[PDB]
Each structure stands twice: as structure tokens, then as C-alpha cells.
Amino acid sequence: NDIPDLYSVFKDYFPIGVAVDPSRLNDTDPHAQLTAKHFNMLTAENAMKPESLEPEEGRYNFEDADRIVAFAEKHGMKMRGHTLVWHQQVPDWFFLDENGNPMVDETDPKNREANREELRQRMENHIKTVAGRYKGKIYAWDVVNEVFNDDGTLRNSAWYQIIGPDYIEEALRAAHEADPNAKLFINDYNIENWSHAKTQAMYNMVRDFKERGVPVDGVGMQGHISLYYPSLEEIEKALKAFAALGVEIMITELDVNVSPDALQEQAERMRDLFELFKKHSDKITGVTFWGVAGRTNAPLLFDRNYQPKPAFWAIV
């Protein structure tokens, strides 16, 4: 093949990743070839979300997740696990009490204290089982995802209402204990802009962890970013700030969301961002492209026929 291997262009800056579907992983399939050719880091689009792994209490299905991991092993890609604890794509059973009522709806102080304990157990068991299964095979775990409201207050999810603010630290310790080799990330969107309240809440929390000894290695910036905003300057201060805490940064779902002028504009923004990422490659340990957009898993980069798009030539 005559075009450059994307991940090679970024050697000794950072790995380049994509999220995949377990259906698309056969040698027969050009998708799988495009993945193996261009990327050296992989995430499960959905196979490792809570609802995928533990549909019912204590019932696990690892089929698709295993296929994805095996794919990474074969091609020697870094595996991101996504995600251990989240308020979305999480089965209802998790948050039901003894009788099968919403735990959230409990008023009695003695029973709440009992619900708290069951949820901690459930959270930790899920963590131990999943991280335990994949022990040593996972470059980085997204241990928690989207813990913040956009205003920078903690999200009032079931996790938070029942366990209270501790669930996060608890998820991180349990992950650390199950697989010490895995980098532990806290992931979110709207945390690219240093001036944003959210980005600052996340800084404060992470700082707190680093100072209190709570294991955390990295912050995951989703990187749903527009053409003009946030400014490269604003992003830079964010990278500097977190890197000052001694945590790594990953861009976990990079996306710069029709016509011929449209494409060339997005390609230039991407050029710019990648310039900025390269400038700070010491602080950044992976860039994964968002890819649900049928369009490829890296829709920014490769057309529906697997041909390079403007954006791809912009960054190589």
C-alpha cells in the first residue's frame, strides 16, 4: 500500500487509536485491514460498557470484548478499556434495592446505609471481574466517565446519590488493586477548554487525588471540538495544567464535526490541533478518533470506500 501508516507518522509522539465494533474484525473485512494498517491503539465502541458486560446481576458476557482484545493482541496494539463506571449504558438492576425498587427513592437512614453498601460491592465486583479477566492486557482503563455536570458540579447520578462523592476514588482504588499495570483514566467531554468551569472542577478533583495518594494516572479529554472553539491557546493551558499535576492526557474521541469547502476547513483545524498535540507530546499518551457516524470508524480520515480524506493528508 502506497499511502502512509497513520500511527507511524506519530511515532515518538503518541499512539493513534480507533474504536471498533467486534463484527468488523475479520481478515475478509477491509475495515479490519484499515484498523491494523493505521492504528496502534484500540477501544471497544460498546463491548466493554457496563450494560454490555453485566446485563443482569452476576451474569457476564465477554464474547465481544474478548474478540476486540484478541484483535489488539494479534496486531500488538495498546488496548483501552472503556468504561468501568458510568451513568449511561448501565443496567437498571445495578440500582435496585432488595424488593426491586429504585434505591434512589429510599428515605429511611438505616436502609440507605445498607443500599450504599450493596452498591459499593456491586461496583467493586464488576471492576474486579472485568479488570481481573483482562489483567495485564489493558494499556489504560477509563475507570469513570462523565462524572461532572457541565457547570463543574458532580453529576447527580445514581452512583453519586447512593455512594455519595466517594464512589470515584473507590472505583480507582478497586481498579488499581485488580490490575496495577493498567493506566487509570478519568474521562469526560467539555474539559478541553482551560477557562471552562468543568475543566477546572476536573483539575481540582484530580489534584486532590494526586495529593491524597488516590491512584489516578490520566485525564481523558473526549475532544468533541469545533472549528473555531476552543482556541488552541485555551486547550494548551489545559494540557499544561493537568501535566503539572503529574497526570497524563489522552484525547479519547476526537471529532471536529458536507461540501468541498467544509472538508478543507475541518482538515485545517485538525492540522492545527495535531500541531498543538505534537507540541505537547510529552503530556499526551494517546489520540483516539470518534467513529460512530456506512462511514468508517475514523470518518474524519477515511471515506466510505476506505480512501484518505482531506483531514488525513492534513495530519500526515
Author numbering: 9 to 265, 270 to 305, 318 to 340
Quote the study's own text.
We then selected the eight most active designs and two natural GH10 enzymes for quantitative kinetic analysis with the chromogenic substrate 4-nitrophenyl β-xylobioside (O-PNPX2). The active designs spanned five orders of magnitude in catalytic efficiency. For instance, the most active GH10 design xyl3.1 and the least active one xyl8.3 exhibited OPNPX2 hydrolysis efficiencies of 9417 and 0.61 M-1 s-1, respectively. To understand what were the underlying structural reasons for this vast difference in efficiency, we determined their crystallographic structures. In both structures, the two catalytic Glu residues were positioned as in the design conception (<0.5 Å all-atom root-mean-square deviation (rmsd)). The high-activity design xyl3.1 was also atomically accurate throughout 13 active-site residues that form an intricate hydrogen-bond network surrounding the two catalytic Glu residues (<1 Å all-atom rmsd), and indeed, across the entire protein, with a total backbone rmsd of 0.7 Å. Furthermore, missing electron density in β-α loops 7 and 8 suggested that at least parts of the active-site pocket were mobile, although design accuracy was high throughout the segments of the design model and experimental structure that could be aligned (0.9 Å backbone rmsd). We, therefore, concluded that accurate positioning of the two catalytic Glu residues was crucial to obtain any level of activity, and that high levels of activity depended on atomic precision and preorganization in a large network of polar residues that surround the catalytic residues.
GH10 enzymes hydrolyze the β-1,4 glycosidic bonds linking the xyloside units that comprise the backbone of the polysaccharide xylan, which is second only to cellulose in abundance in the plant cell wall; xylanases are, therefore, essential for biomass degradation. It starts by computationally segmenting all structures belonging to a modular enzyme family along structurally conserved sites and assembling the resulting modular fragments to generate a huge combinatorial diversity of backbones.
